[PDB]
């Protein structure tokens, strides 16, 4: 918690570089990758965007990965936002000097009570600008409790009262939060009478979390590179008259220039790797950006075939998107992979195709691949991988359970048990893109 005269900023001469600071803060080895290129994957006439990102690992062995793994990425908040926030600070040193945070530690029933300054040691030594851009979350709306604290900092009665109403965290708060999705700087601007101490924000804001992305490349096909498939998150606030808010990491990845440092790390996904046995059938289900890990899969299989002399069992891809002319990302690539024997068949379920009835990936599974799915999973030691949206994944599970009841001639209960065992045996895989 925070209180006046509890924290102070102190100038210091030494400071680690970004990747070291992040490593120290998050207690894990963060590495420095480089942006090689970025390309838009959807049609320019699309209302949305998905970008293809190519990163170079600088030959750093700590960034070794296998198809199916994830890459945690640390983005930077937008500078205009960082600058605007610093401008609303009450006692902020120029934001270009390296400082550390010290906290007045007081002790107990020690009869007189003894205070002692010492390093808080949350953030590493850095400038205020660097702290707000690379280490802290300045975008997540403040909690009712934070607004309560903000109320005691407002010098305008009317504003204090409003803040106090919101601090109740009920109807008024929900309306405010859900309608405005206010960033920290936005709150200070709505209530300009708030006297915001730099130390409060520097110690109370949460740490900026890394964002995970399913690696979209095979390490053999692209040595020293890591590819990502990123949906661009952008949204209108206040029903339309409010400003447009952009996802922090996706917008950052959409802004960086070639050579810019991208702090990241690999997080292995032991339960989302291709099978050790190349001869069993695999069915890949990944609509939209959910196709991401499967790009690493088809590149690896293509490489294994053409360079390792392997003859793996051809896989099946079940993709889905809105329209053939808008968001059918990686279309030509999957086509070429099929031509080289990686895939036996490709399927695409279009949901908003002009003059075409809506189709979801689960529809393809049930209407065109029911017997195939059943034979692969039950009789051929096969695997099924599902990647993407959480609701889609849940719906696909249901479709597979239905296939098991019909094709397998099982009761609801036993179909569920079978699927549960598939998960346990690591033959049913899920890569869900959670919030």
Ligand X SMILES: NC(=O)c1ccc[n+]([C@@H]2O[C@H](COP(=O)([O-])OP(=O)(O)OC[C@H]3O[C@@H](n4cnc5c(N)ncnc54)[C@H](OP(=O)(O)O)[C@@H]3O)[C@@H](O)[C@H]2O)c1
Site for ligand X in 222-241 (CB under 6 A): 231, 233
DSSP 154: B
Three-state SS at 159: helix
Is the CB of residue 320 less than 8 Å from the CB of residue 288? yes
Using rule CB under 6 A, residue 320 touches ligand X: yes
Is 352 part of any known ligand binding site? yes
Q: Which is nearer to ligand FAD, 31 or 139 (CB)?
A: 139
Phi, psi (degrees; rounded to nearest 5) at 31 = -110, 160
Q: With CB under 6 A as the contact rule, which of the stretches 59-67, 92-100, 190-198, 357-365 interacts with ligand X?
A: 357-365
| Helix (H), strand (E) at residue 422 | helix 412-424
Is 282 part of any known ligand binding site? no
Total number of residues binding ligand X (CB under 6 A)? 19
Q: How far is the CB of 355 from ligand FAD (least distance, A)?
A: 29
Tokens representing 335 are: 């086509």
Is 289 part of any known ligand binding site? yes
Phi, psi (degrees; rounded to nearest 5) at 210 = -75, 155
Angle at 221 between CA 217 and CA 225, to 5 degrees: 55
Tokens representing 188 are: 């200070």
Using rule CB under 6 A, residue 47 touches ligand X: no
Q: Which is nearer to ligand FAD, 181 or 302 (CB)?
A: 181
In total, the chain counts a number of residues equal to 435
190, 195, 395, 407: which one binds ligand X (CB under 6 A): 395
Tokens representing 65 are: 């990965």
199, 229, 299, 348: which one binds ligand FAD (CB under 6 A): 229
Using rule CB under 6 A, residue 233 touches ligand FAD: yes
Distance of CA 289 to the CA centre of its chain: 12
The span from the CA of 53 to the CA of 292, in Å, is: 11
Three-state SS at 68: coil
Is the CB of residue 228 less than 8 Å from the CB of residue 120? no
DSSP 346: E
Q: Which is nearer to ligand FAD, 288 or 312 (CB)?
A: 288
Q: How far is the CB of 343 from ligand X (least distance, A)?
A: 19
Using rule CB under 6 A, residue 249 touches ligand FAD: yes
Cβ-based burial of 256 (10 A; exposed 0-12, middle 13-18, buried ≥19): middle
Three-state SS at 425: coil
Pattern 272-301, binding to ligand FAD, x per CB under 6 A? -----------------x--x---------
Strands 315-321 and 234-236: unpaired
| Nearest residue to the partner ligand X, using Cβ | 288
Q: How far is the CB of 105 from ligand FAD (least distance, A)?
A: 34
Using rule CB under 6 A, residue 287 touches ligand X: yes
Torsion of CA 177, 179, 184, 189, to 10 degrees: -120
Is 38 part of any known ligand binding site? no
Strand partners, 136: 207
Pattern 173-202, binding to ligand FAD, x per CB under 6 A? --------x---------------------
Q: Which is nearer to ligand X, 304 or 389 (CB)?
A: 389
Using rule CB under 6 A, residue 321 touches ligand X: yes
Tokens 């079940």, residue? 318
Q: Which of ligand X, ligand FAD, none sits in contact with 235, Cβ below 5 to 8 A by type?
A: ligand FAD
158, 352, 409, 421: which one binds ligand X (CB under 6 A): 352
**What residue spans of 107-231 are helical by DSSP H?**
128-130, 144-151, 157-166, 171-180, 184-190, 198-204
Tokens representing 51 are: 């970008």
Q: How far is the CB of 320 from ligand X (least distance, A)?
A: 5
Site residues, ligand X (CB under 6 A): 231, 233, 287-290, 320-322, 351-352, 360-362, 388-389, 391-392, 395
Binding residues for NADP(+): 48, 234, 289, 322, 351-352, 358, 360, 362, 395
Q: Which residues bind ligand FAD (CB under 6 A)?
A: 70, 139, 181, 211-214, 229-231, 233, 235, 247-250, 289, 292, 433-435
Binding site listing: 48, 70, 211-214, 229, 231, 234-235, 248-250, 289, 322, 351-352, 358, 360, 362, 395
């Amino acid at each position: 918690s925070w209180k006046r005269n509890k924290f102070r900023l102190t100038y210091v001469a030494e400071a680690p570089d970004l990747t070291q600071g992040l490593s120290n803060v998050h207690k894990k080895r963060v590495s420095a990758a480089r942006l090689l290129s970025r390309q838009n994957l959807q049609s320019p006439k699309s209302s949305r965007s998905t970008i293809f990102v190519r990163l170079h690992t600088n030959g750093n062995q700590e960034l070794q990965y296998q198809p199916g793994d994830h890459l945690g990425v640390f983005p930077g908040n937008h500078e205009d936002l960082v600058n605007a926030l610093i401008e609303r600070l009450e006692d902020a040193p120029p934001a270009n000097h390296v400082v550390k945070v010290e906290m007045l530690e007081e002790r107990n029933t020690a009869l007189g009570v003894i205070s002692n300054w010492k390093d808080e040691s949350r953030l590493p030594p850095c400038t205020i600008f660097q702290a707000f851009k690379y280490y802290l979350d300045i975008t997540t709306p403040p909690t009712p409790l934070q607004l309560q604290q903000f109320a005691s900092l407002a010098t305008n009665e009317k504003e204090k009262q409003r803040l106090l109403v919101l601090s109740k965290g009920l109807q008024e708060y929900e309306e405010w939060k859900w309608g405005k999705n206010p960033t920290m700087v936005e709150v200070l601007e709505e209530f300009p009478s708030i006297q915001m101490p730099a130390t409060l924000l520097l110690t109370q804001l949460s740490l900026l979390q890394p964002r995970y992305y399913s690696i979209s490349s095979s390490p053999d096909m692209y040595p020293d590179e890591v590819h990502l498939t990123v949906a661009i998150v952008s949204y209108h606030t206040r029903d339309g008259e409010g400003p447009v808010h952009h996802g922090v990491c996706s917008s950052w990845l959409n802004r960086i220039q070639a050579d810019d440092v991208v702090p990241c790390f690999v997080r292995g996904a032991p339960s989302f790797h291709l099978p050790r046995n190349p001869q069993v059938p695999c069915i890949l289900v990944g609509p939209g950006t959910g196709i991401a890990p499967f790009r690493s899969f088809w590149q690896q299989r293509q490489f294994d075939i053409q360079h390792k002399g392997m003859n793996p069992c051809p896989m099946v891809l079940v993709f889905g998107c809105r329209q053939s002319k808008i968001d059918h990302i990686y279309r030509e690539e999957t086509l070429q992979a099929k031509n080289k024997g990686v895939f036996r068949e490709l399927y695409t379920a279009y949901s908003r195709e002009p003059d075409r009835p809506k189709k979801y990936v689960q529809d393809v599974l049930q209407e065109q691949l029911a017997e195939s799915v059943y034979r692969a999973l039950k009789e051929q030691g096969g695997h099924i991988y599902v990647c993407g949206d959480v609701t889609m994944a849940a719906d696909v599970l249901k479709a597979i359970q239905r296939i098991m009841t019909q094709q397998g001639k099982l009761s609801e209960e036993d179909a569920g048990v079978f699927i549960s065992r598939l998960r346990d045996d690591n033959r049913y895989h899920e890569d869900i893109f959670g919030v």
